[PDB]
Scaffold this motif. Structure first.
Motif, PDB file in Angstrom:
ATOM      1  N   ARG A  14       0.843  -1.185   0.000  1.00 33.52           N
ATOM      2  CA  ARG A  14       0.000   0.000   0.000  1.00 33.52           C
ATOM      3  C   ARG A  14       0.880   1.238   0.000  1.00 33.52           C
ATOM      4  O   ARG A  14       1.968   1.246   0.570  1.00 33.52           O
ATOM      5  CB  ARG A  14      -0.957   0.035   1.207  1.00 33.52           C
ATOM      6  CG  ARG A  14      -2.008  -1.092   1.200  1.00 33.52           C
ATOM      7  CD  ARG A  14      -3.093  -0.913   2.223  1.00 33.52           C
ATOM      8  NE  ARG A  14      -4.011   0.182   1.911  1.00 33.52           N
ATOM      9  CZ  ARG A  14      -4.945   0.164   0.958  1.00 33.52           C
ATOM     10  NH1 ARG A  14      -5.097  -0.888   0.158  1.00 33.52           N
ATOM     11  NH2 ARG A  14      -5.726   1.224   0.793  1.00 33.52           N
ATOM     12  N   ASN A  16       0.191   5.097   1.050  1.00 36.49           N
ATOM     13  CA  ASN A  16      -0.813   5.884   1.749  1.00 36.49           C
ATOM     14  C   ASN A  16      -0.365   7.341   1.837  1.00 36.49           C
ATOM     15  O   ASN A  16       0.023   7.827   2.897  1.00 36.49           O
ATOM     16  CB  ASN A  16      -1.071   5.294   3.152  1.00 36.49           C
ATOM     17  CG  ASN A  16      -2.090   6.097   3.935  1.00 36.49           C
ATOM     18  OD1 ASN A  16      -2.994   6.697   3.352  1.00 36.49           O
ATOM     19  ND2 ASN A  16      -1.933   6.144   5.256  1.00 36.49           N
ATOM     20  N   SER A 128       7.354  -6.791   8.125  1.00 40.36           N
ATOM     21  CA  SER A 128       6.517  -5.691   7.655  1.00 40.36           C
ATOM     22  C   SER A 128       7.213  -4.361   7.915  1.00 40.36           C
ATOM     23  O   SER A 128       7.732  -4.132   9.013  1.00 40.36           O
ATOM     24  CB  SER A 128       5.166  -5.695   8.374  1.00 40.36           C
ATOM     25  OG  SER A 128       4.583  -6.987   8.393  1.00 40.36           O
ATOM     26  N   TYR A 129       7.195  -3.481   6.914  1.00 39.79           N
ATOM     27  CA  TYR A 129       7.843  -2.175   6.986  1.00 39.79           C
ATOM     28  C   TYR A 129       6.898  -1.105   6.479  1.00 39.79           C
ATOM     29  O   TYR A 129       6.122  -1.336   5.547  1.00 39.79           O
ATOM     30  CB  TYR A 129       9.146  -2.137   6.164  1.00 39.79           C
ATOM     31  CG  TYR A 129      10.164  -3.068   6.748  1.00 39.79           C
ATOM     32  CD1 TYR A 129      10.222  -4.399   6.348  1.00 39.79           C
ATOM     33  CD2 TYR A 129      11.011  -2.648   7.756  1.00 39.79           C
ATOM     34  CE1 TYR A 129      11.117  -5.279   6.937  1.00 39.79           C
ATOM     35  CE2 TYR A 129      11.915  -3.510   8.337  1.00 39.79           C
ATOM     36  CZ  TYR A 129      11.965  -4.824   7.921  1.00 39.79           C
ATOM     37  OH  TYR A 129      12.859  -5.682   8.523  1.00 39.79           O
ATOM     38  N   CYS A 130       6.950   0.060   7.116  1.00 42.96           N
ATOM     39  CA  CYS A 130       6.236   1.236   6.646  1.00 42.96           C
ATOM     40  C   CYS A 130       7.280   2.327   6.429  1.00 42.96           C
ATOM     41  O   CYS A 130       7.795   2.904   7.393  1.00 42.96           O
ATOM     42  CB  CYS A 130       5.181   1.667   7.657  1.00 42.96           C
ATOM     43  SG  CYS A 130       4.228   3.102   7.112  1.00 42.96           S
ATOM     44  N   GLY A 165       6.013   7.699   7.587  1.00 41.09           N
ATOM     45  CA  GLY A 165       5.993   6.451   6.839  1.00 41.09           C
ATOM     46  C   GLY A 165       4.701   6.322   6.049  1.00 41.09           C
ATOM     47  O   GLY A 165       3.601   6.432   6.606  1.00 41.09           O
ATOM     48  N   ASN A 168       3.920   0.789   2.581  1.00 43.06           N
ATOM     49  CA  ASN A 168       3.879  -0.470   3.318  1.00 43.06           C
ATOM     50  C   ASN A 168       4.333  -1.609   2.427  1.00 43.06           C
ATOM     51  O   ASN A 168       3.802  -1.791   1.326  1.00 43.06           O
ATOM     52  CB  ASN A 168       2.466  -0.764   3.802  1.00 43.06           C
ATOM     53  CG  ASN A 168       2.119   0.006   5.053  1.00 43.06           C
ATOM     54  OD1 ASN A 168       2.234  -0.513   6.161  1.00 43.06           O
ATOM     55  ND2 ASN A 168       1.720   1.249   4.884  1.00 43.06           N
TER      56      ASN A 168
END
Length: 179
Positions: A14, A16, A128-130, A165, A168
């Motif tokens: 994603r 955002n 998982s990373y943002c 951030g 994703n």
């Protein structure tokens, strides 16, 4: 041909952006697996869609779902080098259409960059990373730091949304037999 490989799987999930403007839609993301910071350091390690397999230095994706099946996910599959070092990193380049160009042009232009070192703090960077987005260009030695915390540069780095951030992704390493 039965082979066994250790692969990196990258899922751009994603994007955002807070921007309600048309320049926040129709974002294209270029993805590369780099062994250094020079443009020539993109490794030919990304599995292509064709048989062979054929290996690419870059893939281009858009992370919208309005035009995809509900079952759709983008998956970038990478043949990891046998020895991974602190110099290896994912590099993401974001492209968009700037609202109101010269002569009413509607072409695509650079928005910014993000990245993920594959090794950081002596740990493989799976999960998982943002990630935030650096605007304009990247400073020397960006790639040995997380994008969340880069030392002060001169000239200074500018970030989208004041360093929030926004991007994703999920990253995982899998070693398996492929037939």
């Amino acid at each position: 041909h039965t082979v066994y490989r250790n692969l990196l799987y990258v899922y751009p999930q994603r994007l955002n952006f807070a921007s309600k403007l048309a320049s926040a839609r129709n974002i294209t993301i270029k993805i590369q697996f780099m062994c250094g910071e020079d443009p020539s350091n993109a490794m030919p390690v990304i599995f292509g869609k064709s048989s062979g397999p054929e290996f690419l230095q870059e893939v281009y994706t858009a992370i919208t779902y309005h035009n995809k099946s509900p079952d759709f996910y983008e998956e970038v599959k990478i043949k990891l080098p046998a020895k991974l070092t602190v110099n290896h990193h994912l590099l993401f380049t974001f492209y968009h259409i700037s609202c109101q160009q010269k002569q009413g042009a509607s072409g695509e232009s650079l928005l910014g960059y993000s990245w993920l070192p594959i090794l950081l703090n002596e740990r493989l960077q799976t999960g998982s990373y943002c990630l935030p987005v650096a605007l304009e260009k990247l400073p020397p030695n960006y790639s040995i730091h997380s994008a969340e915390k880069v030392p002060l540069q001169n000239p200074p780095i500018k970030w989208a949304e004041g360093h929030k951030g926004v991007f994703n992704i999920e990253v995982q390493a899998v070693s398996s037999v492929h037939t």
